[PDB]
Amino acid sequence: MRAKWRKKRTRRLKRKRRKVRAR
Amino acid sequence: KRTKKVGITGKYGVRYGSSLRRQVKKLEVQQHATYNCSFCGKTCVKRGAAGVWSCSSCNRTIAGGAYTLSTAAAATVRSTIRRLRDM
Amino acid sequence: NINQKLALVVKSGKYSLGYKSTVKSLRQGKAKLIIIAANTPVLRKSELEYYAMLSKTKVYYFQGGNNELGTAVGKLFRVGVVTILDAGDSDILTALA
Amino acid sequence: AGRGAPLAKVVFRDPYKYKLREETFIANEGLHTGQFIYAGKKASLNVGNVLPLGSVPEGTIISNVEERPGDRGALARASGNYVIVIGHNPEDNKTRVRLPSGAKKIISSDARGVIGVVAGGGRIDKPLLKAGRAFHKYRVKRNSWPKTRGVAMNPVDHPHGGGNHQHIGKASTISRGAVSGQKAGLIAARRTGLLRGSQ
Amino acid sequence: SQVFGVARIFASFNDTFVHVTDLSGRETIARVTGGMKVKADRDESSPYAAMLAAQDVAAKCKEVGITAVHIKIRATGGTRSKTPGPGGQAALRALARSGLRIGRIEDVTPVPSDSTRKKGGRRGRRL
Amino acid sequence: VVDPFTRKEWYDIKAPSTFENRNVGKTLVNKSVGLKNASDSLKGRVVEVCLADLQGSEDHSFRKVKLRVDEVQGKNLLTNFHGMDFTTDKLRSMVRKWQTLIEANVTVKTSDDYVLRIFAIAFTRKQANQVKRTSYAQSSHIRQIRKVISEILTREVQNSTLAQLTSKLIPEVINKEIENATKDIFPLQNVHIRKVKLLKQPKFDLGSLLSLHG
Amino acid sequence: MPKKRASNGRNKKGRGHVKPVRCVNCSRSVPKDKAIKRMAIRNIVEAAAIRDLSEASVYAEYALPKTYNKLHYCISCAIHARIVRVRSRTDRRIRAPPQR
RNA sequence: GGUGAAAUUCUUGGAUUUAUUGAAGACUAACUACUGCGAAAGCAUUUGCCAAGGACGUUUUCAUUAAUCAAGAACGAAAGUUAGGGGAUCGAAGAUGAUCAGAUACCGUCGUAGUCUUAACCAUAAACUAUGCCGACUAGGGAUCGGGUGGUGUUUUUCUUAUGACCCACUCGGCACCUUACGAGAAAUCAAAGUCUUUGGGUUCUGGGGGGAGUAUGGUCGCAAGGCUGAAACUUAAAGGAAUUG
Ligand SMILES: [Zn+2]
């Protein structure tokens, strides 16, 4: 799909992995 | 060069936060730093209390800003009254 | 302009910088034209006008401070007043400035 | 001490005696020591000079303005503040004036005002950081600092106080027609909550 | 013989003024608009209202004592249109038909010598 | 039902005094109600009128002349030239395609303390024996034309005590001297004054205005 | 869609990206080159009379001026009746104006 | 007011409209074009300083000092980010009227941030002539913008003037056009997309069926937003360019 919704998928990839990794 | 960026505000250490420490750094550089004098010509140092500057090597004092000599809000008034003085 | 002609006095010509050396020259009737700065004080500026009109000498007011009058003469220091005794290839005595 | 404004002390002569009287002026940004100042109706329009509002054109800037004539100063004496002249009237000696909050006011034409913006501007910009900096500000003014929150207090000491959880309980918006003791909160509020842009 | 005034017509879209005044400009006589007479929202600017507005204006000034006028037409102006509306030139005839004299005419729409922004957006009124 | 139209006066406006006809129109004012005079709302008015009405010919039907009201001498209220201006439709006809136009602004004071802003339009001429379409002058030539337009206006004004200046301006004298002076640099055509605004003035001086009326 | 025209929006050539200008009808932003600039002169009195005003008026000759309104139209708006009308393949090439 | 028809509207204790002015912050119309200048992005009221710059003219000057360039640097629309000032108009968010089967969409009335600037940042666009620079050679045709030449040419007229401004021919450099293809091309079209199976003037960069994917991971750069770098497992026989009929 267009590269702002695909691109908004990196919000819930990065910031969710921040809770994961810093642990 | 010792510090990567912190500059003058490294005295506070790790306290108060990043956003406030940079906010202080912009103003605390100006008040401690030197001027270029209008009457004399010489340029060191000088500052003593908020508003009052300063004398280099001559002994004259000037009403300036809190953390700077030339306040830009007063500099435009210096030109505004210049225009109205003509008539 | 005045900045062009002052360069032509320095090379091939004579001049004395500073307040005391100006008064030494004005007393003896040597100076032909003195160049007073802007930021110089009024008490000093009024004195040189009175010294000049006795011996009858031109007093051109240089529009600009002492820091840029020093750069005009080709030096690395502030100057308040510049006399002109004998200009060689220059042409500032003939003109008004 | 304890004032956002550098003062200035000017020496005038006595017209009727061989003497000198010093007057304490608030220095506008532009003044310096060893400078002349011209105060009166016939005085000219420069930074520092004191003129009456009638002999001044529209769109000028002033400070230390008198409400009456003979008030000796009232309006716009704080740091980085200035009054702007808008209008004029021939019938009724009364100029139109805008105060630094926003609310305009009609002042008499013979009232005074010192020209220029008040010195020591940009004082509020720097943050205080450490609490000791805030202590030293109020140390040379009043005893108005370490303020405890009223909800944290007991129900005897303050209306909001009391309860198992720290809550107010009833509306903090209190009327104008109240009495002393009750008035703790927002007094005679038109709006509440977060305001957007325009004041 | 000839006492003059200024007729003034604001020929814009959706409205038509007829604003008669003296030579200086302050003292007015009549201000009968197109939308005052015909009451149906749509028919404020149309030629029907332009006739009826001018006839009422003619009856006012002839009772007072003003024979002729200087017509000075005005469009919406500024950033808007700069185009006279439907009931622009219908106002000029209705004064002549009634028997009120005319002299000197101009259009004085305020054309901005370099202007501020216009409405709609960058893509305009997409209908 | 008040009927305020019938409770009003009628007065005469007067021309001071370089124009041939010394009367214009018939303005009206409300009656002087107890303690409030009608003369307070008469002085300060501005009556803009055509120039051809003041003289006659349609050569001068190209302009607008304002008349600032001043005094009241037995209903004949007196005026004074407030400003000059070209009409709306008669200067846009001049700005044609395929030719450069020029303009120069001037600020000057007369012998009397009267500040006057004053402009001057000038277009480029199409020469005879031209195969070319355009007639554009270079930027170097126009800035020398803009020099000379300012000089001639600063010579005639500064001289002439306002009142005398209008008698020169009405019968296009200023337009001729710019044409002949600048033809060495560039031919030019039309050459007009456009506007003459009046910003500042001295004391009222009511009796000095009367010297015109006579 | 392949290459349609050579010049395209037209006169931006030996020149960077230029100033725009608003349309009359839509109030839409469009380049000043790609503008469709009609110049419409109109009589200030409508020609359906025209005598009726001048019969009752004062003065002889009479100026009777004209408004000088220059107009701009954002391409798609101009196809509604204005100076366009879609052309054929080889008819496109004619830069000479119709009539006169 | 505002609409195709409307409306919450705004107001009457003349709002709208008229005339005199005053303050504030914007943008520089018409003149404005198959014109100019700039390495690009981009630049349009007047005057004064400040240093740079292309072309042209030259029996001046030095005498290969040049071309293209990994690494590494300089600038770089609009939006956006911090922190100040400013804050008129239009205006994402958002309120709020209609239409509509629903409309939180297009239409309308307001409307925060933003739009302007001062110090920092960010480094991307259909940043498009979708055509990398330096060098030759090949075909005609008139216009135009800047110089430089010659014409007892025409005018300006203050008398010859002498400049200027026009005309006729010529010449270097520049933005572009027209007509033909003998050449080239898949063709639309192109005086360069020509001088290529008769293949070789010098040199930098990018690409190798479609998707997954400008994603994963690791570096590196930014306050952030995100840039620069950049895979595979696994899936599939087509995806696509230009033209002709209907
Ligand atoms: Zn449009």
JSON list of N, CA, C and O and ligand atoms in Angstrom, two decimals, chain G residues 23-28 72-78, ligand 1:
[
{"chain": "G", "resi": 23, "resn": "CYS", "atom": "N", "xyz": [-7.06, 32.27, -10.29]},
{"chain": "G", "resi": 23, "resn": "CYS", "atom": "CA", "xyz": [-8.11, 32.34, -11.32]},
{"chain": "G", "resi": 23, "resn": "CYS", "atom": "C", "xyz": [-9.27, 33.22, -10.85]},
{"chain": "G", "resi": 23, "resn": "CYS", "atom": "O", "xyz": [-9.41, 33.51, -9.66]},
{"chain": "G", "resi": 24, "resn": "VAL", "atom": "N", "xyz": [-10.09, 33.63, -11.81]},
{"chain": "G", "resi": 24, "resn": "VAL", "atom": "CA", "xyz": [-11.23, 34.52, -11.56]},
{"chain": "G", "resi": 24, "resn": "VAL", "atom": "C", "xyz": [-12.42, 33.73, -11.00]},
{"chain": "G", "resi": 24, "resn": "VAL", "atom": "O", "xyz": [-12.97, 34.10, -9.96]},
{"chain": "G", "resi": 25, "resn": "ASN", "atom": "N", "xyz": [-12.79, 32.66, -11.69]},
{"chain": "G", "resi": 25, "resn": "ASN", "atom": "CA", "xyz": [-13.98, 31.88, -11.34]},
{"chain": "G", "resi": 25, "resn": "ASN", "atom": "C", "xyz": [-13.77, 31.01, -10.10]},
{"chain": "G", "resi": 25, "resn": "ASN", "atom": "O", "xyz": [-14.49, 31.15, -9.11]},
{"chain": "G", "resi": 26, "resn": "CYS", "atom": "N", "xyz": [-12.78, 30.12, -10.16]},
{"chain": "G", "resi": 26, "resn": "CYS", "atom": "CA", "xyz": [-12.55, 29.10, -9.13]},
{"chain": "G", "resi": 26, "resn": "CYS", "atom": "C", "xyz": [-11.74, 29.57, -7.92]},
{"chain": "G", "resi": 26, "resn": "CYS", "atom": "O", "xyz": [-11.86, 28.97, -6.84]},
{"chain": "G", "resi": 27, "resn": "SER", "atom": "N", "xyz": [-10.94, 30.62, -8.08]},
{"chain": "G", "resi": 27, "resn": "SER", "atom": "CA", "xyz": [-9.95, 31.07, -7.08]},
{"chain": "G", "resi": 27, "resn": "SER", "atom": "C", "xyz": [-8.91, 29.97, -6.83]},
{"chain": "G", "resi": 27, "resn": "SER", "atom": "O", "xyz": [-8.59, 29.63, -5.68]},
{"chain": "G", "resi": 28, "resn": "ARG", "atom": "N", "xyz": [-8.37, 29.44, -7.93]},
{"chain": "G", "resi": 28, "resn": "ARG", "atom": "CA", "xyz": [-7.44, 28.31, -7.94]},
{"chain": "G", "resi": 28, "resn": "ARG", "atom": "C", "xyz": [-6.06, 28.77, -8.41]},
{"chain": "G", "resi": 28, "resn": "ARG", "atom": "O", "xyz": [-5.96, 29.57, -9.35]},
{"chain": "G", "resi": 72, "resn": "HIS", "atom": "N", "xyz": [-7.76, 35.87, -16.09]},
{"chain": "G", "resi": 72, "resn": "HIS", "atom": "CA", "xyz": [-6.96, 34.64, -16.04]},
{"chain": "G", "resi": 72, "resn": "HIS", "atom": "C", "xyz": [-7.89, 33.45, -15.76]},
{"chain": "G", "resi": 72, "resn": "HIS", "atom": "O", "xyz": [-8.84, 33.58, -14.98]},
{"chain": "G", "resi": 73, "resn": "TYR", "atom": "N", "xyz": [-7.61, 32.30, -16.39]},
{"chain": "G", "resi": 73, "resn": "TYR", "atom": "CA", "xyz": [-8.48, 31.12, -16.29]},
{"chain": "G", "resi": 73, "resn": "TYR", "atom": "C", "xyz": [-7.69, 29.80, -16.22]},
{"chain": "G", "resi": 73, "resn": "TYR", "atom": "O", "xyz": [-6.98, 29.45, -17.16]},
{"chain": "G", "resi": 74, "resn": "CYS", "atom": "N", "xyz": [-7.85, 29.07, -15.12]},
{"chain": "G", "resi": 74, "resn": "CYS", "atom": "CA", "xyz": [-7.10, 27.84, -14.87]},
{"chain": "G", "resi": 74, "resn": "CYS", "atom": "C", "xyz": [-7.56, 26.68, -15.77]},
{"chain": "G", "resi": 74, "resn": "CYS", "atom": "O", "xyz": [-8.37, 25.84, -15.36]},
{"chain": "G", "resi": 75, "resn": "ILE", "atom": "N", "xyz": [-7.01, 26.65, -16.99]},
{"chain": "G", "resi": 75, "resn": "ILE", "atom": "CA", "xyz": [-7.19, 25.58, -18.01]},
{"chain": "G", "resi": 75, "resn": "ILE", "atom": "C", "xyz": [-8.52, 24.79, -18.01]},
{"chain": "G", "resi": 75, "resn": "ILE", "atom": "O", "xyz": [-9.28, 24.88, -18.97]},
{"chain": "G", "resi": 76, "resn": "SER", "atom": "N", "xyz": [-8.77, 24.00, -16.96]},
{"chain": "G", "resi": 76, "resn": "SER", "atom": "CA", "xyz": [-10.01, 23.21, -16.84]},
{"chain": "G", "resi": 76, "resn": "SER", "atom": "C", "xyz": [-11.27, 24.07, -16.80]},
{"chain": "G", "resi": 76, "resn": "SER", "atom": "O", "xyz": [-12.31, 23.68, -17.34]},
{"chain": "G", "resi": 77, "resn": "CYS", "atom": "N", "xyz": [-11.18, 25.24, -16.16]},
{"chain": "G", "resi": 77, "resn": "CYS", "atom": "CA", "xyz": [-12.26, 26.22, -16.14]},
{"chain": "G", "resi": 77, "resn": "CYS", "atom": "C", "xyz": [-12.51, 26.84, -17.53]},
{"chain": "G", "resi": 77, "resn": "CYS", "atom": "O", "xyz": [-13.66, 27.11, -17.89]},
{"chain": "G", "resi": 78, "resn": "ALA", "atom": "N", "xyz": [-11.44, 27.06, -18.29]},
{"chain": "G", "resi": 78, "resn": "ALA", "atom": "CA", "xyz": [-11.53, 27.64, -19.63]},
{"chain": "G", "resi": 78, "resn": "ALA", "atom": "C", "xyz": [-12.20, 26.74, -20.67]},
{"chain": "G", "resi": 78, "resn": "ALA", "atom": "O", "xyz": [-12.72, 27.24, -21.67]},
{"chain": "I", "resi": 1, "resn": "ZN", "atom": "ZN", "xyz": [-10.63, 28.76, -12.56]}
]
